[PDB]
Amino acid sequence: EDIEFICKTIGTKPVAHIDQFTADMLGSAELAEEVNLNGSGKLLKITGCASP
Amino acid sequence: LAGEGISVNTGPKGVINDWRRFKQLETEQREEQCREMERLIKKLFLQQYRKQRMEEMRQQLHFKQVFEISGEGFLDMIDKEIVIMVHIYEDGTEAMNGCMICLAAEYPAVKFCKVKSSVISQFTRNLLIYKGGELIGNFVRVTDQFFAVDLEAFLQEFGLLPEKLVLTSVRNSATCHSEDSDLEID
Amino acid sequence: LDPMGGIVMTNDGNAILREIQVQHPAAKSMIEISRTQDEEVGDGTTSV
Amino acid sequence: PLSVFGDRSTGETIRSQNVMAAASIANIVKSSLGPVGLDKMLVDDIGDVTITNDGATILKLLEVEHPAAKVLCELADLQDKEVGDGTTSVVIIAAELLKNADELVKQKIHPTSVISGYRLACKEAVRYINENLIVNTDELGRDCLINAAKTSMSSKIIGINGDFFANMVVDAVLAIKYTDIRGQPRYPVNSVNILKAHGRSQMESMLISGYALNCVVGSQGMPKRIVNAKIACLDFSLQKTKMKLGVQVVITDPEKLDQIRQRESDITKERIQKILATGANVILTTGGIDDMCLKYFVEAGAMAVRRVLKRDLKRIAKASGATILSTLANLEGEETFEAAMLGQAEEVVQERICDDELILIKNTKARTSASIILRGANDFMCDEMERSLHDALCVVKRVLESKSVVPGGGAVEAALSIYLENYATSMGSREQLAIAEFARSLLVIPNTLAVNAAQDSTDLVAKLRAFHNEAQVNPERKNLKWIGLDLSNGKPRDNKQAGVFEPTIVKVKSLKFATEAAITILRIDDLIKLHP
Ligand SMILES: Nc1ncnc2c1ncn2[C@@H]1O[C@H](COP(=O)(O)OP(=O)(O)O)[C@@H](O)[C@H]1O
Ligand SMILES: [Mg+2]
């Protein structure tokens, strides 16, 4: 259910077969870091995307 | 005396509070009776086991007690959260109770427990097995068909007891979370 | 008298205390103390 | 008229009920505060006994029904998670705040004004603490860390033992220090494996200059001491090879069954030969090891340990320089093992600890790691020692990360109360009462400290308030801000020179969390409880 939201946010086009997995179907981003919330958990943030 | 087509209409509307208050207790009583009646009524030189003795004096090497169940205790012990044996008796019971106590040491995954028969006389004048909320074993009056080894063999022959432990110092675990393990950098 | 039907006849402190079931948690602490003394040095169980 | 199948409470009734629940929760743990506090003995109605002084543990173990009591318990849990210390203080402060806020509300003061006053008072208290009451630890040194650890371990089972436990805690924390990117010194607490075992006394607990495993060698054949260890960490079971679901063996020519069966174990034999050909001495794996592989390791004169915990294996690999290998597959499609994946340590020994054995990986190279073996009288004492040790480790981590500390013994609370009751008159017309009540409720900590020692709370708190008022009025008497409470003699004392310190983060987070919890509970003036 999150595939559409992820693709809209980043720009990644989903790949269902390795034959079509090419560079042009990737979503460039400035940073992709997993941060911790002072011991309350972990969150992965992708902040800064070309063509947001 | 006529007008049998009453069409009670909004009559029951003004009594839903009392009707539902009675109905909640009625449903609880029906559930308790069904759980009680789930077991009852439904069905109410190699041959000499040379390994029996060795299992006997290797079982004594451990002592806690089986939980004594409170009518709703039986309901909510099985309603939530594996193979579980429940003992029904009123104070041969002591022998099989000791057998269950001995077996509980070797079976940490089981929830050996006992409960009074009075709280739950046709079945009282003269061993219940559960797993995941459904009945598996319903052996009643097992004296007709003891030692802990004998009970273990009897339960294993039916394929109910799980098939088969180093001893730690005391304990190691403290919690389980984002421990933030050491990450050497530069 | 073992609940499993056996008989333990001894005068060791740890052996006596290990077969006794108690409800007061202070007694449980004392029994654990007896077990610790037995496991560590193996003697002086009544003395502790 | 509503015809809602449930009970309804509205007005002063529900507010009084919520304050009742909060006060009951506070009174549960009020007796376990400060060095003159005493532990509690919890029984889990199956015979299990827990002895503890930690507020979070007590609130987690207790069965709670009222929603406000649940809120306070979750508040204690959050304080423990985010800081690790001051778990009782935050609960007590929140309950006192709620009580005083409800007292104000009963005087026809609108709850919105009380909430605004509480928010303003919390912000001003944090600002005042940061501006005045913080002490920089740069000029103090290791003594500051030792004093902070000792203060944290007060009221605990290792209190008098502090002179040694503080040194142990400081050494253990400093051993695991690492600097990440941005040059920030990070201290990964919970990487220190705390092992417990009854027996010998507290004084002779061991601090390991390495790592300690609660595991033993898989078989008696292998030696129990290797000097120049070459640790090989594996994440797979070393057992007889079995094909996956998609592979099925069907035999038509009977002559090949023996070859199939022989290869079935020769695969694992070859894997072990490849692993051991590089000179590995100690092999740790998360999966199991069957008898034949154990015999291979025995003949090779190495060590094999099975069922190693994943976190323990990761810590060992990081400390010794080894790398976890879930499989021996390289980028050429082959099956190889290289010496570059071997971790080294100065010694690996299977030591005996009170009729039981554990593995000590002493002095791992390329990284320093620490572990603590707690020796006590029984299981309960060891568990309480572990909890207190964790609290001390968290306190030391907070002090080392943020280099600001504040005086303990209620000095901060008294200074905050004086400053806030003076500042409330500066602004506001109706939230002034809320700020004044915040200041008054901040005095519940020194009051409880004095009560727990059977000292005259009124006189002690009055003297503390007089000292702090003189500090805040006379510019040349600003050195009186450190006047705390000396519970041994029941007299005010300068805690800064006495060595009673707490991290500033503890007080700040406690204040913020307590204020938010009190605000959350204060917003309710109606409760609907539907029948199940
Ligand atoms: N040696 C000491 N002298 C005076 N006060 C102290 C001393 N050690 C600790 N205190 C104070 O006692 C209070 C209670 O601490 P405690 O309840 O044991 O910690 P926690 O709240 O984490 O359980 C702390 O706020 C601290 O300021
Ligand atoms: Mg003797």
Ligand SMILES: [Mg+2]
């Ligand atoms: Mg504390």
